Design a protein around this nucleic acid. Structure first.
Lengths: 145, 141, 206, 63, 67, 100, 143, 82
RNA sequence: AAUCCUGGAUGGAACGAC
RNA sequence: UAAUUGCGAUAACGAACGAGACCUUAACCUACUAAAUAGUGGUGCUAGCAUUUGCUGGUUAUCCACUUCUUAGAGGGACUAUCGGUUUCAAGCCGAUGGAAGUUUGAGGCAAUAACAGGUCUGUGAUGCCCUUAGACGUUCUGGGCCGCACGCGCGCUACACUGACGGAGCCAGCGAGUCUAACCUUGGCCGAGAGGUCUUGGUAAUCUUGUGAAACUCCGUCGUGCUGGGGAUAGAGCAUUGUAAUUAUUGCUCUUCAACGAGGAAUUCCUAGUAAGCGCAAGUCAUCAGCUUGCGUUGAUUACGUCCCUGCCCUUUGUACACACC
């Protein structure tokens, strides 16, 4: 029932983390465009940064934006329970991170490379491009590439 | 003592028992009035006997229903059938027969199931198929 | 009229819809005289109902469904295409919203409107195969009133459904504008278009 | 674009290779005493009413 | 269909040809004397026999019947 | 004394004959009781493929076992209780008496 | 005439009651609120998220007033629901139990609820009168 | 991979999610004379988004320009007050 | 007391035996 | 006629099997028998509000009374009853009335003669023959494999979205299973986000799990036609459980990854009433694992009530160079 008319300070698509984020859609499902970011993490961080989730992304302040960025790239300092993380007890240092736009794929490649140079079964499977989770390969994944 | 009866309406598996007696016109359903059923339209469906016969006949009498079994819709249908049956039995026993029979006539004239239960029962499930009549599928080649 | 009191409270409008008259959900059933004959004795009006939900069994015998209220037939047809099978309650809600809309627009009885639409969109002729074997053709023939009715209803429902598919306009308002275009005769209605198609083909294959 | 109403008086039988069709003899309401034979598509009974888009025709009776 | 078997019809014929000065055209009493006068293992069968006997008596009341 | 007697058998007419002779014995001895409470009989289903091998039409077969359970509450002296434990014994019928 | 919770609609009653408790602002909040889904069978947390603990407490309180005794098992059985296991068919799943457990603990804290014999929890008389008054106000709002 | 169909594209409308003073007063002047009003009305007319239409219906109903007749969620229905 | 009446059918293509 | 089911006709008469009959199950019984391992009402005690009577509840040793609902057991009840038509006017058939039920009431079980060179020696301590019979094809232990994938077929599960998804509240079934020398179904209490863990409890069971408060469903809100908050495969990482052992992930949970898919071509399957279809639940196998089956129930349609055109089936007549029989 409330209707603020508008101001021209609105912006369409913006940029952060080297990602062309689309405005004019609600902030949570907007942020989930980022690689390494899902609905849970996004809703949570937008809650922790003290944001109105009814708002649209393209109508915001750079301060809110950068605070959200900081919370995203440094979660634990803002009281996150450490099991939301996509990469915890990582593989080498045992510290718990949350990999993002390019780091997600880079780390995935690093893991596959590790296993391949290890000559592990999973690594060989990935190297051949087959299925790895123990699925069957008789009738499925035919036109896989 | 009180002039009082107890009847029941039925459905697939939903049963609506209803005690009835002389009272002041309170009409309850397991804890609560008729107006709080919340299909919100089957509400009108269960009003129907009252809407047919007028509410004046309900002033001197109270009803209390306990319902179980089946889904919400079946519960509603059992409810209204039990209601009509209790009203009819009351008008039979304590009131004369003319009121009872014209009441029954009006009910059956609007709808038959308000008094009698529909004998449609679930048919069982046979092998070779998920349901009763349906089979799975035929494969030739 | 008199507003009576009970131990439990009853609203006055429901008291009125109880004793003063038997409505629809909230509409009249009278002054809805069908216009075209030969659909009479096959649409069930003058036997009012407060809701189109009824555990009626017209599927035991042949011509029983004529005594089923047309609105129950509408609700019945609305629940199809898989996921909507059953869920008659939703169909009824949709009917109710639709009638509200058809009472705000074209403020006549929406019941009168839909029955006039039915009478309008009744395919009077239809083609069919007849032959001495390999020598067979699409002979055109006359349609029963019952079949006119069923075909009309199916056409209306399908037009509304295919209109509301994959787009924002609700099933209800689609149905509403379809019924309106059909009641008037517009050639924009899916139903009217199919009807003119069929009758033209019948004319051609005489 | 006129029509002609007719009342059913006598059903004859089913027809068509697939039997989804019915023969009937009707009686015109206006200009009564006129009885024509026709084919029909769907379910039908006596005393029903039909709408000949053309009244001047009739199918090959099978009898 | 609702057709009756030769067992039914034979038994009904026997009962009619040797208990005519007896049972009338009421299904209920004809049943209640059939189960008394003869041995039947099923209520269903007894009812069928009673009904057919009653129909044959209906026939008899207007002229005879062959057999 | 407050005994329960329980009959957990299959052959319903045997169970009924046992219950009947027992209750006439109890009432001619003039003993208070509850009538024979017939618990709702229970069915044991077993659905199996008729065929031993795997081929043939996909047929199934449900073998049933009906079980009828009755029980009675008595207040009765020890001597009548003992002789009753002795008597009214039918084959194919499982019976059990308990006190308190 | 006297009234009960059984004499008022559930949705509006619960709305009024959770509003009353959020206005009262004393009951409890665990701290890990607005972080969970209430159910492994859910996929997103609640949409409001500035509350809803009051709402769940209201629902369970009404439930207890309707019933005699309840348990975390019953509440999980109830508030749980259809899980979407991707491709495999939907299935019933019990809701989160710790949430309802903390709800009941906070309710015993505020004194609306007590522990029952025969296990489980039970309505209090204080809670009885309080809910009666709230329902009175509820069907008073329409005057 | 043969598809066995045609699968043409669409026009891809670009409805608005926010408004402006021009859109707002255009709404305020044009919502009357709409004998029937709802979300699909306010989107096949004015190219606002669905959430905008919801909020705007609520707004107009608040002050009273549109008359509500039924407020079922998933189907809100109003007319013009005259 | 009026009173005129009837019997009737077309039809495409469809190889072979391991 | 559903039917060699009957009326009848009659070089045939009387019989038999099958069908039917029968049995089970589901519906009716305020008529019998009863029942704290099922309910109901009342009386006691007790909570709240109204208070002015009341309403809503709770209350095992408060008892009292009853059995409508629930269970059963014994019986009854429909036989097409009555009426009107139509039929050589018989079998019967159609409509209507009544009736709980009027398509052999509904669905099932049983289900003939004769045969298939159907399938099964991997169920059989059923089995003849042949092979083998101590570096055995016996037996048993380790580890693999039965899942291996460039591809083609069939049973299905998911969806391709607003008749919607998501979040809240709302909130209703029935079928049945369950610990003994075992360790099963688990209530309740605590912890944990969650899975789950843990301390306890009842139960050999109409009693306890369990009202199995299931899901779909409804009311509110967000979303907004954008391969989109649809869809959620493929992957990564981590936390849990079962099991000696999970590594080609057993399975469960969390986060992240978010691909085809925009209603499906030739062809083709099932289906006539509580049925299709949707919606889930139980049991089976089971240490764990349902996307499968067998049963269960909840919501609940359309369209016929006809035909032999296709696919086939039964009887008769006819023709036939056919007889491992139109392949």
């Amino acid at each position: 029932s409330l209707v603020v008319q508008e101001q021209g300070s609105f912006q369409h698509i913006l940029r952060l983390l080297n990602t062309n984020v689309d405005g004019n859609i609600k902030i949570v499902y907007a942020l989930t465009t980022i690689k390494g970011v899902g609905r849970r993490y996004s809703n949570l961080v937008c809650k922790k940064a003290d944001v109105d989730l009814h708002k649209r992304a393209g109508e915001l302040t750079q301060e809110e934006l950068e605070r959200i960025v900081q919370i995203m790239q440094n979660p634990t300092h803002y009281k996150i329970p450490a099991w939301f993380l996509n990469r915890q007890n990582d593989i080498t240092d045992g510290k718990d991170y949350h990999t993002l736009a390019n780091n997600v794929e880079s780390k995935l490649r690093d893991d596959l490379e590790r296993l391949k140079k290890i000559r592990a079964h999973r690594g060989i499977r990935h190297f051949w491009g087959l299925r790895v989770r123990g699925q069957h390969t008789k009738t499925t994944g035919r036109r896989r590439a | 003592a009180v002039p009082s009866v107890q009847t029941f309406g039925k459905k697939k598996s939903a049963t609506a028992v209803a005690h009835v007696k002389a009272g002041k016109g309170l009409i309850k359903v397991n804890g609560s009035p008729i107006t709080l059923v919340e299909p919100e339209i089957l509400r009108f469906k269960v009003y129907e006997p009252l809407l047919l016969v007028g509410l004046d006949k309900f002033s001197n009498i109270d009803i209390r229903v306990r319902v179980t079994g089946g889904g919400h819709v079946s519960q509603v249908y059992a409810i209204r059938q039990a209601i009509a049956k209790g009203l009819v039995a009351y008008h039979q026993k304590y009131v004369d027969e003319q009121s009872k029979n014209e009441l029954k006539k009006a009910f059956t004239s609007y709808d038959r199931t308000l008094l009698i239960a529909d004998s449609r029962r679930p048919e069982p499930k046979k092998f070779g198929g998920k349901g009763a009549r349906s089979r799975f599928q035929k494969s030739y080649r | 009229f008199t507003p009576v009191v009970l131990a439990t409270p009853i609203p006055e409008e429901v008291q009125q819809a109880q004793t003063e008259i038997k409505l629809f959900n909230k509409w009249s059933f009278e002054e809805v005289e069908v216009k075209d004959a030969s659909l009479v004795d096959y649409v069930q009006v003058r036997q009012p109902i407060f809701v189109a939900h009824t555990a009626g069994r017209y599927a035991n015998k042949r011509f029983r469904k004529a005594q089923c209220p047309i609105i129950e037939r509408l609700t019945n047809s609305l629940m199809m295409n898989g996921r909507n099978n059953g869920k008659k309650l939703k169909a009824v809600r949709i009917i109710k919203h639709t009638l509200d809309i058809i009472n705000v627009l074209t403020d006549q009885n929406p019941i009168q409107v839909v029955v006039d639409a039915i009478t309008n969109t009744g395919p009077r002729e239809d083609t069919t195969r007849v032959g001495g074997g390999g020598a067979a053709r699409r002979q055109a023939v006359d349609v029963s009133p019952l079949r006119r009715v069923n075909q009309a209803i199916a056409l209306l429902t399908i037009g509304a459904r295919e209109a509301a598919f994959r787009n924002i306009k609700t099933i209800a308002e689609t149905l509403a504008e379809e019924l309106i275009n059909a009641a008037k005769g517009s050639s924009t209605s899916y139903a009217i278009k199919k009807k003119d198609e069929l009758e033209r083909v019948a004319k051609s294959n005489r | 674009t006129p029509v002609t109403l007719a009342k059913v008086i006598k059903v004859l039988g089913r027809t068509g290779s697939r039997g989804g069709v019915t023969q009937v003899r009707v009686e015109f309401l206006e200009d009564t005493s006129r009885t024509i034979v026709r084919n029909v598509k769907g379910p039908v009974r006596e005393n029903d009413i039909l709408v000949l888009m053309e009244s001047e025709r009739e199918a090959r009776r099978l009898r | 269909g609702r057709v009756r078997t030769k067992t039914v019809k034979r038994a009904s014929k026997a009962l009619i040809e040797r208990y005519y000065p007896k049972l009338t055209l009421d299904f209920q009493t004809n049943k209640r004397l059939c189960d008394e006068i003869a041995t039947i293992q099923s209520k269903r069968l007894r009812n069928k026999i009673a009904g057919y006997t009653t129909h044959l008596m209906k026939r008899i009341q207007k002229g005879p019947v062959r057999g | 004394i407050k005994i329960r007697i329980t009959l957990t058998s299959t052959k319903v007419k045997q169970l009924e004959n046992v219950s009947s002779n027992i209750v006439k014995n109890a009432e001619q001895h003039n003993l208070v009781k509850k009538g024979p409470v017939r618990l709702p009989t229970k069915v044991l289903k077993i659905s199996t493929r008729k065929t031993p091998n795997g081929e043939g039409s996909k047929t199934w077969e449900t073998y049933e076992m009906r079980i009828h359970k009755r029980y009675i509450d008595l207040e009765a002296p020890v001597q009548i209780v003992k002789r009753i434990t002795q008597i009214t014994i039918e084959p194919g019928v499982d019976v059990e008496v308990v006190v308190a | 005439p006297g009234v009960s919770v059984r004499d008022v609609a559930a949705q509006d009653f619960i709305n009024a009651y959770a509003s009353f408790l959020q206005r009262q602002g004393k009951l409890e909040v665990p701290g890990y609120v607005d972080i969970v889904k209430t159910s492994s069978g859910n996929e997103m947390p609640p949409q409001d998220a500035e509350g809803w603990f009051y709402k769940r407490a209201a629902s369970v309180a009404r439930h207890i007033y309707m019933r005699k005794q309840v348990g975390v098992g019953k509440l999980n059985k109830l508030y749980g629901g259809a899980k979407s296991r991707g491709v495999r068919p939907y299935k019933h799943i019990d809701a989160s139990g710790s949430i309802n457990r903390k709800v009941l603990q906070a309710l015993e804290k505020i004194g609306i609820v007590e522990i029952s014999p025969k296990g489980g929890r039970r309505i209090s008389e204080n809670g009885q009168r309080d809910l009666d008054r709230i329902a009175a106000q509820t069907l008073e709002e329409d005057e | 991979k043969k598809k066995w169909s045609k699968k043409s594209m669409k026009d891809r409308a670009q409805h608005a999610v926010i408004l402006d003073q021009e859109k707002y007063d255009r709404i305020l002047k044009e919502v009357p004379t709409y004998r029937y009003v709802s979300v699909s009305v306010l989107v096949d007319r004015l190219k606002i988004g669905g959430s905008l239409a919801r909020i705007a219906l609520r707004h107009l109903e608040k002050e009273g320009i549109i008359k509500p007749i039924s407020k079922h969620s998933k189907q809100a229905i109003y007319t013009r007050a005259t």
